Amino acid sequence: ANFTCAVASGTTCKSAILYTSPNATTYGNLVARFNTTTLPDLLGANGLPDGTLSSAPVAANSTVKIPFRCRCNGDVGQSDRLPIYVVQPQDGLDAIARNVFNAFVTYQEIAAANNIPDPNKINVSQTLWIPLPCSCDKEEGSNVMHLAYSVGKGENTSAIAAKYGVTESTLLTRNKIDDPTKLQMGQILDVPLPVCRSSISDTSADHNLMLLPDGTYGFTAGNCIRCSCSSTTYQLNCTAVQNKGCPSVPLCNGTLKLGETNGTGCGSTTCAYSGYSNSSSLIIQTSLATNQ
Ligand SMILES: CC(=O)N[C@@H]1[C@@H](O)[C@H](O[C@@H]2O[C@H](CO)[C@@H](O[C@@H]3O[C@H](CO)[C@@H](O)[C@H](O)[C@H]3NC(C)=O)[C@H](O)[C@H]2NC(C)=O)[C@@H](CO)O[C@H]1O
């Protein structure tokens, strides 16, 4: 029982952990550690500039947002069979949870996830699925990107909620908090980040994956589309990337190209990204969006 999720089992989502690096590293090393995402999406998930190298620093005890695919079973959200940890010479399931994964999981959740019958015995070189806490669920019938937050000391629900642009209301109903007062340190919180709206269709492969809070960006459709989110509008801004193994992007009707707008204000209309499909070959779809 990590983060509650109530959507149909098998449903996948994009979620994240706010990861605290014990040691100094680089963004490149985080990518190798988690392998839940690509470097440019990790960079974009934190709002670093496009074309930043993997050697971008991560200071000791600094925090990096690490996106991953979440799978929901009946009741809870779990990171979808990633990340995969390889046991070193004298690891232990409890040390691994706490000192590698910030206590986002418990050793029991690890063992249960890998069918290990006595939490005390794991072999060198044994691989472990680490199921990070996540969802899935909507907030108020609005899409959100849940983020797993490890409460540092001196914090409170007021400050956190302002930090992420969330009402303190949703935080308390989503997280079981009797008396906020003083939040206990080390507590894991479900923080549903607001995200841009999109025109990405149900039928589309990336339908629940382009969930971008403010200031972040991401890539989709075999890296042929770039999507960015600003709170300025909260409408996903998509653009064609121009790798040249990439398919053409259709106009809307005729004459409106991706990102272009027709009309004036509020009643204006925009050629948006609505998804892609991959049977046979990569096809990108677009559709007119009304000003939201
Ligand atoms: C059909 C066949 O023989 N294919 C081989 C693959 O099975 C094998 O992949 C390895 O599989 C084992 C189990 O499939 C993996 O270990 C499992 O890992 C999950 C988390 O990843 C963990 O929860 C399971 O408990 C754990 N089970 C076991 C038995 O350890 C292991 O990670 C895979 N190794 C790699 C490198 O992918 C590959 C590897 O040789 O060979 C195929 O021929």
Side-chain angles (χ1 to χ4, degrees):
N2 55 28
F3 299 172
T4 289
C5 182
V7 299
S9 184
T11 300
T12 57
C13 219
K14 195 228 208 186
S15 278
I17 55 162
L18 185 53
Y19 178 79
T20 306
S21 184
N23 306 326
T25 31
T26 66
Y27 268 69
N29 297 303
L30 287 181
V31 174
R33 169 95 78 210
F34 286 82
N35 207 22
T36 60
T37 179
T38 64
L39 171 65
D41 276 358
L42 181 62
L43 291 170
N46 286 280
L48 270 76
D50 299 57
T52 302
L53 310 171
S54 83
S55 66
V58 180
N61 293 328
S62 68
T63 55
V64 174
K65 200 172 153 284
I66 295 183
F68 60 80
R69 190 171 70 203
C70 167
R71 177 192 177 275
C72 298
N73 57 31
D75 301 342
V76 305
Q78 311 169 297
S79 62
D80 200 353
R81 323 304 184 49
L82 300 170
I84 289 172
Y85 184 82
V86 188
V87 172
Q88 295 317 300
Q90 335 192 251
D91 286 353
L93 236 48
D94 182 73
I96 288 172
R98 305 200 129 97
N99 312 333
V100 178
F101 295 101
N102 297 175
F104 281 119
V105 290
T106 200
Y107 69 84
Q108 297 109 330
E109 276 158 335
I110 302 188
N114 303 267
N115 216 337
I116 294 161
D118 181 33
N120 298 312
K121 5 184 171 294
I122 60 177
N123 265 248
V124 176
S125 309
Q126 185 187 348
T127 60
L128 296 170
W129 163 38
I130 299 310
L132 312 151
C134 79
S135 189
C136 287
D137 281 321
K138 282 198 194 197
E139 208 54 27
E140 288 321 329
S142 289
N143 294 313
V144 286
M145 188 215 79
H146 298 265
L147 167 52
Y149 184 87
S150 189
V151 174
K153 210 180 61 159
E155 308 192 340
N156 40 93
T157 45
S158 183
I160 296 169
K163 179 147 67 195
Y164 292 110
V166 182
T167 78
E168 184 178 1
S169 145
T170 69
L171 199 61
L172 302 182
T173 66
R174 184 81 200 168
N175 275 284
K176 160 39 197 76
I177 305 197
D178 301 38
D179 216 340
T181 100
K182 161 232 153 198
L183 286 167
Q184 183 179 303
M185 144 165 192
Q187 182 175 2
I188 302 316
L189 289 183
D190 189 349
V191 179
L193 301 203
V195 296
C196 292
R197 331 146 213 289
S198 64
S199 301
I200 292 176
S201 155
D202 289 351
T203 203
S204 183
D206 46 17
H207 167 51
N208 275 124
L209 304 178
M210 292 317 105
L211 308 179
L212 296 165
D214 175 75
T216 68
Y217 64 89
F219 298 91
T220 196
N223 285 265
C224 290
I225 291 290
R226 181 178 181 284
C227 308
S228 66
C229 166
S230 169
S231 51
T232 282
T233 60
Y234 265 130
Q235 189 74 27
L236 209 68
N237 187 318
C238 305
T239 61
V241 144
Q242 313 283 352
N243 319 328
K244 109 166 326 171
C246 276
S248 63
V249 191
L251 317 171
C252 271
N253 288 319
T255 66
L256 249 307
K257 211 167 329 183
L258 185 50
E260 266 150 52
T261 297
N262 167 262
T264 79
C266 307
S268 81
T269 199
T270 305
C271 178
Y273 170 75
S274 44
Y276 76 100
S277 85
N278 207 9
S279 97
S280 318
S281 58
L282 216 154
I283 312 162
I284 297 157
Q285 304 131 33
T286 64
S287 80
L288 222 43
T290 168
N291 193 321
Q292 284 299 104

